[PDB]
Amino acid sequence: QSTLRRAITAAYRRPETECLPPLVEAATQSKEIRDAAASTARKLIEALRGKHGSMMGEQFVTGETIREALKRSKELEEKGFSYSYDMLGEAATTAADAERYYRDYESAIHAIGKASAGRGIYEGPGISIKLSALHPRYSRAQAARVMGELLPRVKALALLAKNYDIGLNIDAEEADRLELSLDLLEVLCLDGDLSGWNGMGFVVQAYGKRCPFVLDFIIDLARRSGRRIMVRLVKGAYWDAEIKRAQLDGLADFPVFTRKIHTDVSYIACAAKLLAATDVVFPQFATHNAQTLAAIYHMAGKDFHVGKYEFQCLHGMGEPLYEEVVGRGKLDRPCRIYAPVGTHETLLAYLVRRLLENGANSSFVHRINDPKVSIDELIADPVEVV
Amino acid sequence: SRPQSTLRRAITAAYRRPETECLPPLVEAATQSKEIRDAAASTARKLIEALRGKHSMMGEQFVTGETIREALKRSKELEEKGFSYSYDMLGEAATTAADAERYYRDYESAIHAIGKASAGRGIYEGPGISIKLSALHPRYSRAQAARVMGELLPRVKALALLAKNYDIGLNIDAEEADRLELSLDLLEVLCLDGDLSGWNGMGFVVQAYGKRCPFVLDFIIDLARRSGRRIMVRLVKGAYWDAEIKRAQLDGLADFPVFTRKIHTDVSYIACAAKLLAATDVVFPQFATHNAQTLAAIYHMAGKDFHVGKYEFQCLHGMGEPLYEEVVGRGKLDRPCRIYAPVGTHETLLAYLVRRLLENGANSSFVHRINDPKVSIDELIADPVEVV
Ligand SMILES: Cc1cc2nc3c(=O)[nH]c(=O)nc-3n(C[C@H](O)[C@H](O)[C@H](O)COP(=O)(O)OP(=O)(O)OC[C@H]3O[C@@H](n4cnc5c(N)ncnc54)[C@H](O)[C@@H]3O)c2cc1C
Ligand SMILES: Cc1cc2nc3c(=O)[nH]c(=O)nc-3n(C[C@H](O)[C@H](O)[C@H](O)COP(=O)(O)OP(=O)(O)OC[C@H]3O[C@@H](n4cnc5c(N)ncnc54)[C@H](O)[C@@H]3O)c2cc1C
Ligand SMILES: O=C(O)[C@@H]1CCCO1
Ligand SMILES: O=C(O)[C@@H]1CCCO1
Incomplete structure (x- = not known):
């Protein structure tokens, strides 16, 4: 427990109207930055609107196996992209399922770490994992017990990632599991067995009221x-x-x-x-x-x-935009592609979230193709609109 | 005894009966003769081989129109071939009384439009409507059946009376398992209501993935x-x-x-x-x-x-037309098919579209397996009853 942890818990269900003023102030940019950003955004969107899948989900999977996905990554890697591979799988319901997902993650780390070949955590590929894949009652068992059995599995994977010097990211899932996953991050970052490795990664969700306070704690x-x-x-x-x-x-x-x-x-x-x-x-x-x-x-x-920062996108969604970003002829900033790997069966749940994402009238990826939505609207600064 | 005591007790007893106990009577009832299975395999092979010689996640292909007038206009071509329609004004799981009133008015206006389009074709040859009870009562999943019944029954009766007045079909869609019992009690009250006499358009869905399905059917028959x-x-x-x-x-x-x-x-x-x-x-x-x-x-x-009028097949708009183009019509199987036709926009599409993705994306679904190179035609035409 700490002042930083208390700020997280207190924000859990803070009234939406009380959350906004400090975010509005922090998101306010100078006129020079706002004008430059509007110019860059217009250029990107005009390029996107010069550019343009089925329920098989083919658009969203990088390969069926890690070997297949690694081979398909060379073309974009030399363009300036990197990868974070995800062996598809989540919400394990049995011990056998959680054990199988563990084996998938472990085998992927070995393949990715060997393929990385000493490129390190920024220039080379990494892996993403879901904690719900690694415990058979992740959301339905007591948080203390869940973290206790989960910790040795995640530590073992992190140690392999350290051995190869690759990134290992913990994906963020449902809101009620933020606290558990954050406690695990803290244990790992204080574990001397992982010293000298900067590959531990963690997702924070800005749709959540606790987001700035989680970031203060992590920083x-x-x-x-x-x-x-x-x-x-x-x-x-x-x-x-x-x-x-x-x-x-x-x-x-x-x-x-x-x-x-x-x-x-x-x-x-x-x-x-x-x-x-x-x-x-x-x-x-x-x-x-x-x-x-x-x-x-x-x-x-x-x-x-x-190594200062990077952008990231999902495989099958971000390439049109980021082809206008990566590379010396564009903005010369790197982008890491989240690359799902698996069979059509393990793909289904991830696909549902992509449908909710792409099909929502409020999503940028839907609006970019909507004839009713102007470029002027797409470049609006959220602080100025709220 | 309580009215229909034996039939109702059989439904309740089946609710969560162990799967292995449910299956033996179904396996026996589903067993067909070798001669019939051979003929059916030949028919299934022909249908699948057609399904490839003659022939999106965002699901524009799942919605027939944004308004009932638009959906009705777009139905003429397939009706000319021998298909019929059941229109669904998209919307479900009303969270407020105002939402439930909006959906009620959507259904009511649709019945008038569908009934005019039907123009006396009747309940089999002409179009009908499908409704979801969760659209018509706020917190349908949460409120006690006493309160849900007392407010929902007059609304459904009013819609059924309009459907009777135009002689069109009105179907109650089946939703989550915990609302089966309420919906079936409502069906009974409507079927015994003399104000609806002379009209055979009331319809009801039963879900064969449910353990109660044969016992619900016994009750309905x-x-x-x-x-x-x-x-x-x-x-x-x-x-x-x-x-x-x-x-x-x-x-x-x-x-x-x-x-x-x-x-x-x-x-x-x-x-x-x-x-x-x-x-x-x-x-x-x-x-x-x-x-x-x-x-x-x-x-x-x-x-x-x-x-x-004996029986019909049905399919979902945007899914079943390729298969049923090999069914409807004298030179095919000479059997009719009714298309379930959603009507609405992105504001009311979400829940339905999720179910379509889960249906189309699942490795176990026929519509997925037909495009799966690892699945032989032999496997697609195999009778599953013989597996068990
Ligand atoms: C590489 C990568 C990794 C990711 N990893 C994760 C992860 O581990 N866990 C996770 O949960 N997400 C993760 N996401 C995010 C998620 O998958 C979506 O891609 C993302 O939220 C879309 O945001 P956007 O800026 O592209 O689009 P935008 O169109 O700008 O924003 C869409 C988002 O707004 C939010 N939203 C929509 N409607 C509302 C509303 N009415 N009220 C409040 N918020 C609303 C949703 O978050 C929605 O996704 C990841 C995304 C990427 C690109
Ligand atoms: C016109 C029409 C109206 C419909 N109305 C309704 C309705 O009111 N309510 C409703 O709930 N459904 C309704 N359905 C059914 C549902 O929407 C699907 O279309 C249907 O279940 C798919 O069955 P299938 O024979 O086409 O395909 P198949 O591929 O043969 O069967 C797929 C089905 O098997 C079942 N299933 C999948 N995995 C398992 C499993 N592991 N164990 C047990 N069962 C499994 C599911 O029911 C799934 O949909 C309707 C369908 C049509 C065509
Ligand atoms: O699984 C998902 O949908 C998100 C995007 C990638 C990681 O977590
Ligand atoms: O809404 C659904 O998904 C099903 C199919 C049509 C009626 O009920």
């Missing part, structure tokens, strides 16, 4: 532990399910925002916090929204080196 | 006999499987209200089809499926005697 943890934690800032993939759970629970105040523009303001405010902490954390700005991207690109300033 | 209504019965597998599994896990159940082996649902469907085909005097069976093997099995089970 402080990185600074005191000496681990340069990789922090993937996302909006969030489970919004519809969080709303349904909160409505059923009789909750007046939800753990997530209910207006999309509030999530957008939260993201920019949290990006400002991360960009002020690049000494101690490695921010990873995961977004397909060209306005969000352009804002961060200008907020980050003129100084850049590989 | 008996209800048809005592009410004098020829109840339209849509036999489906079911659309909420993934959600039912998750809910039963969170409910702490040792035995779930749905089957967990996919071929058990197939056996259940065929057994229930045999029961319906033996009761066509008092119910109108509507076999909703996109599975060519299921379709062929029922086509042969039904035998050589057919007339429009």
